[PDB]
């Protein structure tokens, strides 16, 4: 799939907006995915023991990787659909190390959408979130293809 550039535009607008505070909304967004889907707290065996959402928001580690994960999908972003070289290396830890099904990054993705929605409502009308989608929903299909080529395709 291409985005056009208006698409691009509205995508990199909102992500400017992220990016005044990349931990809070990477807290965010964490959060909301294990409050979501549980079994995704599974496969971070750093704070996989946490019960709560107040222990997650006290949980140094959790918003670290949280900072770690927004700025790698912020690099990607930007790149505007030419990733290939960034996502190789993310593809390969994903499907061989951390084993990530491509579910999961649904679920992530529909997370990131969920707060930007809540954080962002005049910056994220409907175009803006269709144009956000179709950039998730872009990278999510890239990123498998790369799974299967590497032998997970999960
Ligand atoms: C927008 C989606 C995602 C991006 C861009 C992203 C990016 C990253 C980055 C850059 C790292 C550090 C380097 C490396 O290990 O490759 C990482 C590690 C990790 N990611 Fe992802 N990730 C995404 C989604 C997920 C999802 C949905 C899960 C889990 C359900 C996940 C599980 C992990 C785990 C377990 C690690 C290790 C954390 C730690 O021990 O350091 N990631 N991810």
Not at 103 to 126: C, D, M, Q, T, W
């Amino acid at each position: 799939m291409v985005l056009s550039e208006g698409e691009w535009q509205l995508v990199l607008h909102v992500w400017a907006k992220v990016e005044a505070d990349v931990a809070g909304h990477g807290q965010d967004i964490l959060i909301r995915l294990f409050k979501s889907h549980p079994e995704t707290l599974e496969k971070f065996d750093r704070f996989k023991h946490l019960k709560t959402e107040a222990e997650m928001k006290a949980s140094e580690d959790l918003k670290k990787t949280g900072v770690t994960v927004l700025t790698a999908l912020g690099a990607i972003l930007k790149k505007k659909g030419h990733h290939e070289a960034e996502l190789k290396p993310l593809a390969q830890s994903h499907a061989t190390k951390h084993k990530i099904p491509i579910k999961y990054l649904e679920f992530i993705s529909e997370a990131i959408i969920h707060v930007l929605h809540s954080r962002h409502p005049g910056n994220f009308g409907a175009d803006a979130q269709g144009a956000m989608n179709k950039a998730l929903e872009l990278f999510r299909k890239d990123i498998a293809a790369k799974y299967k080529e590497l032998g997970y395709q999960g």
